[PDB]
Design a protein around this ligand. Structure first.
Ligand code: K78
Ligand code: K78
Lengths: 546, 546
């Protein structure tokens, strides 16, 4: 039975292929057919190209040898190469043009999801060109999705040499009949077949995937749209900053480019951004996904006043100071969204741009006590239940798995009504003891939140709600201001507490506000509709934040 | 007795002042004298500018109010403002032109070094202009050097209001006679004097500093050149990446821009880069200062083979992968310098540029065993002493304070001869029990290294030396290559083991190599000559690495 799938890079996982560019260049320059492909393969196992592919020489050392082979070939063919003929230019363009073959990667991702071991086996070179970063980026994006990456220039062997196939099997820890091997070069497929592997000659992707699904018995074509790439907590870079003596903030960090600081809601984690972290890093951003104060690996002091907006914002400014960042774009959800609006109002110099998911910006009413304002909207009743220290902690900490399974559900799966929470005597009083698992989360993902909340519980998280008066007095100092930095408001159709209509007057205070809207999306925006969140955020970052 | 020094920002810590730009603009445009300074202060305590300085409105909201005041003033003066008059343009230019007053900052740094509490007290605004980052950067650089930063727009009070002076004293926890207060505005100096503070009216910096040194009794003028800013370990962002099941790498991270990965030598720490970290971050780079495998907070497995160059390099590539970095510039010293050359030879696509301090690049000799090569140079005798597992560990771990105090000394302070180490029976056999403290290090800095080495000791660090044969076989695979990526070799005149002449043939293998050279510098380059290292590295980064 098959249990391993091996893919070539050029012409399989990445298109268009290099062999095609030599043929394309011959045609564009009206050179004899095959002239450049001949100079490229000149000397066969003893030639310049084999030396490059084995890692004996670098790509920049190889360029003049390929130039001399082209001259020899042209001399023999009794033709002249054009006036401004350049091997460097031809390869720079071809490498830059080559992009991931998305349906082929999707098929590899599905086989791996189904328990296959996956690998990339490639005849490649040591790239020292000034433009090498583009290729480094492609390989980075690709390699993360596979168990192994075997590069000819690192192992000192090349396809079709028999040794590289024995090396492949040793690394896979598999017998040949257990392996599918996909290649666009029939000659490089021959030794794998000779060993007894299943082989697929890739011309067009659709046919190759039909052969691959027929031989594996796994649906790979016509499949439902997959979710964005998620995060494995043990595979991330974890950062820690002391903002004051008893307060440390933890964050997960991925990517390069402008800093993007993700701020989660209640009762969440950095992990609530799992579907956004890889997508934003891939889009050219340096992502910093926080455990907000009171959560996960960040400090959770017990005092209510440690959680007022003024202090939380001051600490986030200190966080930037200690990291040596003059600015970050701030993106928040729920309580994180309320924080990012206040970061924009009090520290605009430090905020590159601001985005909120669900949480609208509503100026404080100086003529009404915040408790009166909460009482005025029936959907905010749960905030009154959260006031008394210890009451909601007892209910939320009683059974962690039940807490997260009851909370984290799509709009059509709800188990909690948020009206008359105080009257009912809790959030979960009419909820099952053993809730079903929402289609939004796996059992493993629920257990990650359970493990994180074992450290500090719900005191610090609930304390974010216990500073209504303090936050109202501080917010009133900002009433004459407008938010004039780049701003995005993302509404969720089916969030029945943070209703889209609550955001309706935001342009009065944020005149240049840009918007996004997600249909059939409940409160847990990032995990409910991750593809759409990623689309809205990347589009806005690229246009408004750099 | 004085124990606190307070500095204004505009016209004191940062020059040229804003008041000067309004006067300069009046003159350049031939407007009536004082017209713009009049419109700026219009309405006094009730005016637009006071509202801005108190944080009632932002800088972008203030712009049209200042425009209306300029029009009113011009109408009263019976003059016309020019055709393309713009308050936005005038302030963008002035803010951008304003730079840190380096001698004033140096004086604050010295008073703080001598035990004074220091603070910045400033009438400032909430900056929401599109070009706000420049000012955010200035404030970041400045604020790190002071105990407190009091901004009028954050406290809702302005100089010369009496309340802000009482607020200052409360934050300083000092009586007025204990405070020196420096301001360029005599009217803002008046309430501090009225309270009994020592006050200095800053016109030219030299006179202000003469008054400041006369009143404090501390030399501030004509002082020796200070060292670059160092790092406080508890103030840094600390990152952790698992590269494989039992291996985690720790690093300290500071700044934004291209990633710069600093790789220390034997037997060191991320902390060996303490003088480079702030300077490189300030120069526009994202610094990642590693604890190399076997050191500090990084994992230290016991096996010799975990420390061969091939594995150490593979792990550094995985480190980049997990952080989501396609490249980093790699800068190494000693064993770190040997590593970065190998990163350049085996992973050029991942190396933006490469620099080594002291460690030259010498290709492996395939016709001589590495042990024969070590035996051929008498200064390399200590490497033979390091071979036998446990021998050097016993000597180095016996008394940590003695180990680091004996090792870390300037060229004119040496206590260790490196010739006939095996014959002598150790590195410290002719060294004192209680070595004196080198002028390069403080007692506290020695204790940091002592604390770091308490975790894993010297087994992992010494294992970097125990892979001579393995490293030689791997290096031989690279003999046909050249290093063609941007490269810098920094030699140290007085490193008596890694002599500058050892680097003499490097251009044969690295044709485009750039160089730096430090006179009167021993082995501990970064701490021996930090100002000169910083100069050489920043110049090379800005020209060759981005
Ligand atoms: C209490 C839970 C987590 C179940 C919940 C469920 C829904 Br549906 C929801 O919309 C919110 C929103 N919490 C808002 C907190 C931040 C905030 C406070 C005051 C005003 C606006 C936003 C919370
Ligand atoms: C052993 C100590 C730390 C005292 C020392 C003192 C001096 Br002075 C010195 O120059 C070196 C250099 N160590 C070099 C290690 C890396 C390397 C190995 C082989 C060849 C070159 C460089 C080490």
């Amino acid at each position: 039975t098959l249990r391993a799938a091996v893919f070539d890079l050029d012409g399989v996982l990445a298109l268009p292929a290099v062999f095609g560019v030599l043929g394309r260049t011959e045609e564009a320059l009206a050179l004899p057919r095959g002239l450049l492909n001949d100079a490229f393969q000149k000397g066969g196992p003893e030639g310049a190209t084999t030396r490059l592919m084995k890692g004996e020489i670098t790509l920049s050392q190889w360029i003049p040898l390929m130039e001399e082979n082209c001259r020899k070939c042209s001399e023999t063919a009794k033709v002249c190469l054009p006036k401004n003929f350049s091997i460097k230019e031809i390869f720079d363009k071809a490498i830059s043009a080559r992009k991931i073959n998305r349906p082929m990667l999707q098929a590899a991702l599905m086989l791996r999801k189904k328990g296959f071991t996956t690998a990339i086996l490639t005849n490649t070179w040591l790239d020292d060109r000034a433009e090498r970063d583009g290729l480094a980026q492609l390989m980075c994006e690709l390699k993360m999705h596979f168990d192994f990456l075997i590069e000819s220039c690192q192992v000192g062997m090349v396809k079709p040499e028999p040794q590289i196939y024995k090396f492949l099997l040793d690394t896979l820890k598999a017998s040949p009949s257990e392996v599918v091997f996909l290649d666009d070069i029939g000659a490089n497929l021959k030794p794998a077949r000779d060993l007894g592997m299943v082989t697929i000659l890739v011309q067009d992707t659709d046919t190759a995937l039909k052969e691959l699904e027929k031989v594996t018995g796994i649906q790979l074509l016509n499949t439902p749209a997959p979710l964005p790439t998620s995060c494995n907590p043990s595979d991330m870079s974890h950062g820690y900053v002391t903002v004051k003596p008893r307060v440390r903030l933890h964050f997960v960090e991925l990517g390069s480019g402008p800093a993007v600081c993700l701020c989660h809601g209640f009762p969440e984690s950095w992990y609530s951004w799992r579907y956004q972290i890889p997508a934003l890093a891939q889009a050219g951003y340096r992502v910093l996904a926080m455990d907000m104060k009171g959560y996960g690996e960040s400090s959770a002091p017990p005092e209510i006043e440690e959680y007022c907006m003024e202090v939380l914002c001051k600490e986030m400014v200190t966080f930037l100071d200690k990291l040596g960042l003059s600015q970050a774009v701030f993106i928040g959800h729920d309580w994180g969204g309320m924080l990012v609006w206040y970061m924009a109002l009090f520290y605009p110099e430090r905020v590159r741009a601001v985005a909120s998911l669900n949480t609208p910006f509503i100026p404080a009413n100086p003529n009404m006590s915040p408790l009166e304002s909460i009482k005025a909207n029936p959907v905010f009743d749960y905030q009154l239940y959260f006031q008394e220290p210890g009451v909601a902690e007892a209910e939320l900490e009683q059974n962690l798995s039940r807490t997260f399974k009851s909370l984290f559900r799509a709009s059509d799966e709800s188990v909690l009504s948020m009206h008359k929470v105080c009257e009912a005597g809790g959030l979960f009083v009419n909820s099952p003891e053993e809730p079903s698992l929402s289609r939004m989360v796996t059992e493993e993902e629920i257990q990650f939140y359970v493990q994180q909340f074992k450290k500090s519980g719900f005191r610090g998280p609930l304390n974010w709600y216990r500073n209504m008066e303090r936050n109202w007095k501080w917010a009133c100092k900002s009433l004459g201001r407008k938010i004039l930095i780049p701003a995005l408001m993302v509404t969720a159709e089916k969030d029945f507490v943070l209703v889209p209509q609550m955001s309706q007057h935001m342009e009065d205070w944020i005149p240049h506000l840009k918007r996004g809207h997600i249909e059939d999306c409940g409160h847990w925006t990032q995990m409910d509709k991750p593809t759409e969140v990623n689309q809205i955020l990347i589009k806005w970052l690229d246009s408004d934040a750099r």
